[PDB]
Design a protein around this ligand. Structure first.
Ligand SMILES: [Cl-]
Ligand SMILES: [Cl-]
Ligand SMILES: [Cl-]
Ligand SMILES: [Cl-]
Ligand SMILES: [Cl-]
Lengths: 253, 258, 258, 257
C-alpha cells in the first residue's frame, strides 16, 4: 500500500524517502538553515524529502533542561518551513489534546515508541485523519505491530507508516533485526515501512556505522529512512540512493 | 530509607507490604468485595496491605475495552475503600492534570513504566508531595533508575518506591534479573524496592510460576510484593500463597544483612 | 527423580547438596587444604558435600596460560581426596577418550556447557554409567534442556543432573531466569536441578551479589548449589554464606509442594 | 587483509565468494552430483565457489544421525572434487589429531563455533598452516572475536576467516547484528568476514524470502563471502540478486577519512 504525502509517493516499492531534520526546534533561523541544507542535498541527488523536528523534548535530562520552543511557536516555525520550501513535515505528539492542532499544520504525525500502547493517544491521532508514523517499541516483536495497526483501523485511519527503531538487547543496547522489516510487511498489509537509523544507534567510527546500518536495512526494500546531519550527509545519501535504486529495480520474489 | 504510609512502615528491612487488588475499577460493590477478601486474609496473617486498582487503564488491548470508572467516580470508590477498611490505597496517573486530585485521596501515586521518562508527569507527580511508586520500564537497566530518582529529587520529592516489573528478553518475553534489586538499592539510596510479580509474568501451573518468582525475588530482601488477583492469581488461593511469602520474608528479614 | 551418590540423596525435594571446590587443580597439598575446609564447614552445618575441581582448563584465553595438573596427576589427587575424606567428587571431561578413565575415579562427571552438543562426548560419558552433571549452555532455553536429556536417555544413562549457569543477555552479560528451574523440572522428568551461581555472575560487592543470587535460586526449591571459592567467593566467608543458604533451603523444603 | 585460496582472492574488498555444499559426505557419486549443481550455477554467473561438506560431523541433532563417511574415505572424495572441478574445498574438524591429515587435502579448515575456545583444537588447526574459517559463537560478542584471532596468531597462523552466524536473542531466537561485521573488521585487522545466513535463520515466500533479505542486508555491509548450510533456478535467482548488490557495493570506494 502506498501513501501520497502531497506530491511524494511513499511505499515499499517506490524510491526511498528521506525523513530528517533536527532533534528539537530551538529557533526559526536555525531551523530554516538546517532545512535548507537537507533540501539542497536531497534536491541535487533527486531524493524525496520530509523535514522532521520535535517541538518539545518530552524526556529532558533535567527538570530544568531546555524543552524546545513548545507547541504554539513550534507550529509557527513548521508553517514557515512549509511556505519557504514547499515540503511536508513530520513531528511527534505526546498528549491527546496536541493531536488536532498539530495535525492542522504537520503532514505526518508521529506516535512515539514508548507511547505506542497508549489507547487515548492512538485514538486522538487516528481521528485527525492525518498520515501517522508508528514507531515500533523496543520491546515489541515485529509480528505484534499488527495489533497497533488494528487499533488505528478500528479508529478509522489507515494512512499508517511503520517505523523500525531497534530492539532491546540486554541492558542499555539495541539491535536491529533485519528480518523484522519483512515480518511487518507481511503481517500489516504491506504498509510503508521506514527505518529510523539514528535512534537505532543511540546506544552504540560512528558515521561509518550509521552508513552500514542504513545500507543493510535499505537492502530489504523499504519506503524510507531517517538520518541526522566534510559533506557527510551527501556522501551517505549518494550510497543509499545507489543501493535503493538497485534493490527497487529487482522484481519482488 | 523507610517510608511511612499512614501506620505502615515500608522499607527493605521491614516486614513486606502487600500491594494488591484489581486491574481496573469496574464497580463499587465488586471492588469492596475483592478488597474485603484481601483485608481478611492479610489481617489473619498480620501482613500490611495496600489496595491497588486503576481508575483509567490507559493501555487496553482494544480501543473500546472499558477504561474503568474514570477519575471522579474512581476517587469516590477509593474514598469508600479507605473509610470501610482503614487501609491505604494506590493508583496510577497518566496525565499531569490528574496528579493533584488523585494525590488528595490516594496514599500512593504510581508512575506507569511507559511514562517514566515523561518529564512533565514526573514533575507534576513530584510536586504533589505524595508517596510515589516508580514502575521500572522493561527496557531500562537497573543502574539507570537513579536518573528518574534524580528528577524527583530535583523537583523536591524523596518519598519514592522503586518497582521491578521485569526486563525485555528477546521478543515478547520478560526476565527478572534478581541482581537488579541490589543494583537499585545501591545506586538509589536504599529506597524501598517492591516486586510486581504479576506484570513480570504476563509474557509467560501459572500459579506455581508466580510463587516461584515471588519467593525468589523476596529472598533478595525487599520492601514489598505487588500483585493482581482475578475474582493474575486466583483470589481464593491468596491465603496459601501469602503464607509461603510471609514465611520466607520473616526468615530473611530476621537475619542481619551480611 | 532422586539420585543416590554414595550415601548422598540428591533431589529437588531433598536437603540441598553443595558441589564446591576450586577452579583448577594446581597441587595435592593445596587441594587437600581447600577440601578440608569445605569438609569441616559442611559437616558441622550438616550439608551434604561433593568436592569439585577441573584437572585441565581447556579454554584459556592464552595458549601459554597455566592449564592445571592434567589428567594423570589430577586423578591421583582425586583418589587421595576420596581416601582422606570419604566424599564424592566431580570433574569435567572435554574429550571422549577421557571419560572412561575419569569415571573410574570420579563419582560425577561433568559435561561442559560449550560441549553439550558434541554427540561423541555425550555417548562416551553416558556409556560410563556414572552420574552426569549437564552444564546448561548460555544459549539454550530451559524448555530445550530436554534435548540433551533425550540424547543421554537414548545412550542409556538416566542419572542426570541439570545445572543452571545463566543465559546470554545482550553482549557479554548473563541473566538467570528464576522460572527456568521450574521449566526444567516440568519438561525433564523432575531430574535434580542445581544452580551454578559462580559462573552465572562472571560477567558482573561480589559477595553480596552471590548471596542474593544464590538465595533467589534456592527459593525455587532446588537439589543443589554449585560454587567456587578462592583461599569466586573468599574461602573464609564460606561458612557464613552457607549458614544463610541452609536457613532458606530448610524453610523451603519444609513447605509442602504446590 | 586478503587471503589467496588457490586462484580465488577472498577479501572484504573482493568479489564475494560462495561457500556451500552438503551437510555430510555420503558417497563420491552423491557428492559429485551436488557439487556439479553449485559449480554450474556459480560458473554461469562468474561467482567464485568453495565446496563445503563434513566428513565427521560431531554435533548432529541425534546421537545416531550419520556423521559422514569418515576421514579416510572423506578425504578421497574431496580429492576427487578438487580434481574434477578445480575448486577449493572446506570441511570442519573437531579432533586435534585430524587437523593435519585433513589439511593435506582441504584448502580451508573450519573451527566449529562451539569449539572455538578449545585451545588444543585451535593450536592443532593453526599449526597446519592452512586457511581457517572461524565460526563465531552465538554467545560471543563481536569485539571478543579478536581473542580467538590472538590465539591463532600465537600459534603461528594468520590466514583466518571470520564467519558470522547470529547472536542469541532471548530464548531460541537468533538475531544478526549488522554492526558486528564492522566491529570485527576494525578489531581483527580487516580479516575476511563471511556471513553464514542459514544458521542465522534456523530458529525463525517463507524461508527463501527471509534468507534473501538477510543475505542482502549482510552483504550490503561489504563482506568477503556468503556461507550456506543445507531450485536449481531458485539458487540461481538468489545468487543473481546477491551478485548484483555485491558488485554495486564492491565497486564503490570505502567511505572517505
Ligand atoms: Cl481495537
Ligand atoms: Cl499496575
Ligand atoms: Cl515497560
Ligand atoms: Cl565448572
Ligand atoms: Cl554457537
Amino acid at each position: 500500500m502506498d501513501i501520497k504525502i502531497n506530491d511524494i509517493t511513499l511505499g515499499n516499492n517506490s524510491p526511498f524517502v528521506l525523513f530528517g531534520g533536527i532533534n528539537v526546534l530551538e529557533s526559526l533561523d536555525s531551523t530554516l538553515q538546517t532545512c535548507a541544507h537537507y533540501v539542497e542535498v536531497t534536491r541535487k541527488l533527486g531524493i524525496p524529502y520530509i523535514f522532521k523536528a520535535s517541538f518539545d523534548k518530552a524526556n529532558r535530562s533535567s527538570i530544568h533542561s531546555y524543552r524546545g520552543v513548545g507547541l504554539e511557536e513550534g507550529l509557527k516555525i513548521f508553517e514557515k518551513v512549509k511556505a519557504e520550501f514547499g515540503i511536508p513535515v513530520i513531528t511527534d505528539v505526546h498528549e491527546p489534546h496536541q493531536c488536532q492542532p498539530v495535525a492542522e499544520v504537520c503532514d505526518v504525525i508521529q506516535l512515539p515508541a514508548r507511547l505506542a500502547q497508549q489507547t487515548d493517544l492512538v485514538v486522538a491521532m487516528a481521528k485527525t485523519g492525518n498520515v501517522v508514523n508508528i514507531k515500533k517499541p523496543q520491546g515489541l516483536s515485529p509480528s505484534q505491530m499488527k495489533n497497533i495497526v488494528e487499533k488505528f483501523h478500528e479508529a478509522g485511519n489507515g494512512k499508517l507508516i511503520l517505523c523500525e527503531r531497534g530492539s532491546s538487547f540486554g541492558y542499555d543496547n539495541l539491535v536491529v533485526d533485519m528480518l523484522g522489516f519483512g515480518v511487518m510487511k507481511q503481517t500489516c498489509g504491506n504498509l510503508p515501512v521506514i527505518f529510523d537509523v539514528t535512534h537505532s544507534l543511540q546506544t552504540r567510527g560512528r558515521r561509518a556505522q550509521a552508513l552500514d546500518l542504513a545500507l543493510a536495512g535499505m537492502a530489504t526494500r523499504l519506503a524510507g529512512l531517517f538520518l541526522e546531519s566534510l559533506h557527510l550527509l551527501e556522501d551517505f545519501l549518494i550510497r543509499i540512493k545507489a543501493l535503493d535504486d538497485l534493490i527497487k529495480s529487482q522484481p519482488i520474489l
